[PDB]
UniProtKB/Swiss-Prot annotation, chain A:
Reported function: Component of the 26S proteasome, a multiprotein complex involved in the ATP-dependent degradation of ubiquitinated proteins. This complex plays a key role in the maintenance of protein homeostasis by removing misfolded or damaged proteins, which could impair cellular functions, and by removing proteins whose functions are no longer required. Therefore, the proteasome participates in numerous cellular processes, including cell cycle progression, apoptosis, or DNA damage repair.
Residue numbers of the full-length protein present here: 24 to 81 of 310
Subunit description: Component of the 19S proteasome regulatory particle complex. The 26S proteasome consists of a 20S core particle (CP) and two 19S regulatory subunits (RP). The regulatory particle is made of a lid composed of 9 subunits including PSMD4, a base containing 6 ATPases and few additional components. Within the complex, PSMD4 interacts with subunit PSMD7 through their respective MPN domain. Interacts with TXNL1.
Biological source species: Homo sapiens (Human)
Tissue expression summary: Widely expressed. Highest levels in heart and skeletal muscle.
Domain of life: Eukaryota
Similarity annotation: Belongs to the peptidase M67A family. PSMD14 subfamily.
Protein name: 26S proteasome non-ATPase regulatory subunit 14
From Swiss-Prot, chain B:
Residue positions where N6-acetyllysine is found in the record: K44
Official protein name in the record: 26S proteasome regulatory subunit 7
Signal peptide as annotated in the record: none
Gene that specifies this protein: PSMC2
Function: Component of the 26S proteasome, a multiprotein complex involved in the ATP-dependent degradation of ubiquitinated proteins. This complex plays a key role in the maintenance of protein homeostasis by removing misfolded or damaged proteins, which could impair cellular functions, and by removing proteins whose functions are no longer required. Therefore, the proteasome participates in numerous cellular processes, including cell cycle progression, apoptosis, or DNA damage repair.
Subunit structure: Component of the 19S proteasome regulatory particle complex. The 26S proteasome consists of a 20S core particle (CP) and two 19S regulatory subunits (RP). The regulatory particle is made of a lid composed of 9 subunits, a base containing 6 ATPases including PSMC2 and few additional components. Interacts with NDC80/HEC; this interaction is detected only during M phase. Interacts and SQSTM1. Interacts with PAAF1. Directly interacts with TRIM5.
Compartments reported by the entry: Cytoplasm
UniProtKB/Swiss-Prot annotation, chain C:
Protein name: 26S proteasome regulatory subunit 6A
GO CC annotations, alphabetized: cytosol; extracellular region; ficolin-1-rich granule lumen; membrane; nucleoplasm; nucleus; P-body; proteasome accessory complex
Gene name in the database record: PSMC3
Signal peptide: none
GO molecular function, one term: ATP hydrolysis activity
Keyword terms, alphabetized: Acetylation, ATP-binding, Cataract, Cytoplasm, Deafness, Host-virus interaction, Intellectual disability, Neuropathy, Nucleotide-binding, Nucleus, Phosphoprotein, Proteasome, Ubl conjugation
Species the sequence originates in: Homo sapiens (Human)
Annotated localization: Cytoplasm; Nucleus
Length: 58, 83, 351
């Protein structure tokens, strides 16, 4: 039962990829994934970000 | 307030019972069936919708021009109703 | 065969294609499975100046007009101003077009699952479903429109309805006043829709009655209520003339009175067969009555003379009504088997 202060690190990579995902942000429901490495508990870093093919199920 | 007391005390599990049954498409009524997988349904807003029958409702329990409860999300029919 | 050794690589590329189309052919099923609503499609030809101009006009059930070209897979019966088309979210594209007709109601009219003349009639209705394979060598073109008429009291309606059971196909029922309504311009829509159902469905049987009353050209110049079925018939003949699809399922017409006749009804696609009824005989009616009553239990002694003689200017439905009436009092007579005198008793009863 322990909780610390976490802060999400965002680079230009994931940002621009989410901008392209913004162009992909058509009303059709879309999927995406984020990758990175955890050095410790209270910090989180994301680096590799890509998109996913659309589907009719959503 | 006293009759609503025990009910207010019984309103605790309603939060955990809120997840199902909550979906309402406002009971759109059907018309006819050309084929079994796909049915044509006409809402009271005069907008025709099409959705496949779920596994929770038997195709033999479907009557022509019958009002049944229908999901507004999955668009399928979870449960029918007598009236 | 050294030059033909390069074919193997080609076949490998082809089977590789067949292997790599699995996924893109797989996504079709999950994507196109559930169209969320139904929209009206109207075809409009545009011009781009390949870069060929293509477009369409859409009408949503929510009354919101959008823009979109003509797309989707290979189309055949499509491009027509129909309804019930597949559509995805925000895409407003066209995937599966199925025609259920317009204002369905007219279409669900009904669901149905004298020897020398009835022989010719039976042969006439049987031959288009039979001799088509022999029509190539013989070059015999089957008649389409068939005019069945005669003096009142014949009972030709239930006779043709009885022949419809012999055709084994689906039978429909359309009357004269059914073509007359309060609205206007119903003729074209009715004809086009009926021909649409005739195009989509199996070679069923279509029979219309009372074409004489609705086909009256009213020599008297003062007034009358219905001019509509006149031009409806004219348009019907037009589509039965200038159209190649007319080789499809036939439409049978019948007139009660010969007072009104259109000289333009003569054609292969139009009315061809003309048979006048010269006071139909008795024994034949007794025969068909025997065929109808063979199912019921009756004492097998009948002179047939009395029942043949007592029938004058009576329909077939009236003869069946005589049989039914004979079955009515046979229940309260206490007898479990129908007798001979019950027939004539019924005749003198209802008539």
């Amino acid at each position: 039962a322990v909780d610390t202060a976490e802060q999400v690190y965002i680079s230009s990579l994931a940002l621009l990829k989410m901008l392209k995902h913004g162009r992909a942000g058509v009303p059709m429901e879309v999927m995406g994934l984020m990758l990175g490495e955890f050095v410790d508990d209270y910090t989180v870093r994301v680096i590799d970000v890509f998109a996913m093919p659309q589907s009719g199920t959503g | 307030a006293p009759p609503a007391l025990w009910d207010l005390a019984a309103d605790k599990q309603t939060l955990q019972s809120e997840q199902p049954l909550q979906v309402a498409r406002c009971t759109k009524i059907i018309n006819a069936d050309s084929e079994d997988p796909k049915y044509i349904i006409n809402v009271k807003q005069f907008a025709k919708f099409v959705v496949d029958l779920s596994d929770q409702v038997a195709p033999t329990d479907i009557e022509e021009g019958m009002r049944v409860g229908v999901d507004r999300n999955k668009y399928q029919i979870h449960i029918p109703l007598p009236p | 065969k050294i030059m033909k050794s390069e074919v193997l690589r080609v076949t490998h590329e082809l089977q590789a294609m067949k292997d790599k189309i699995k996924e893109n052919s797989e996504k079709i099923k999950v994507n196109k499975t559930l169209p969320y609503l139904v929209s009206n499609v109207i075809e409009l030809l545009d011009v781009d100046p390949q870069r060929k101009g293509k477009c369409a006009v859409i009408k949503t059930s929510t009354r919101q007009t959008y823009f979109l070209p003509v797309i989707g897979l290979v189309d055949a019966e499509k491009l027509k101003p129909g309804d019930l088309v597949g559509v995805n979210k925000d895409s407003y594209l066209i995937l599966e077009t199925l025609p259920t007709e317009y204002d369905s109601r007219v279409k669900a009219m009904e669901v149905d699952e004298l020897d020398k003349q009835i022989q010719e009639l039976v042969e006439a209705i049987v031959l288009p479903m039979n001799h088509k394979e022999k029509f190539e060598n013989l070059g015999i073109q089957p008649p389409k429109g068939v005019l069945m008429y005669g003096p009142p009291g014949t009972g030709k309606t239930l006779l043709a309805r009885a022949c419809a059971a012999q055709t084994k196909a689906t039978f429909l029922k359309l009357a004269g006043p059914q073509l007359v309504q309060m609205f206007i311009g119903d003729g074209a829509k009715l004809v086009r829709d009926a021909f649409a159902l005739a195009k989509e469905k199996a070679p069923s049987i279509i029979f219309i009655d009372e074409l004489d009353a609705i086909g009256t050209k009213r020599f008297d110049s003062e007034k009358a209520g219905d001019r509509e079925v006149q031009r409806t018939m004219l348009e019907l003949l037009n589509q039965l003339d200038g159209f190649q699809p007319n080789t499809q399922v036939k439409v049978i017409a019948a007139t009660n009175r010969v007072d009104i006749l259109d000289p333009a009804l003569l054609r292969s696609g139009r009315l061809d067969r003309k048979i006048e009824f010269p006071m139909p005989n008795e024994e034949a009616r007794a025969r068909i009555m025997q065929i109808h009553s063979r199912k019921m239990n009756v004492s097998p002694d009948v002179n047939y003379e009395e029942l043949a003689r007592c029938t004058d200017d009576f329909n077939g439905a009236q003869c069946k009504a005589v049989c039914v009436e004979a079955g009515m009092i046979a229940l309260r007579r206490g007898a479990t088997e129908l007798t001979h005198e019950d027939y004539m008793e019924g005749i003198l009863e209802v008539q």
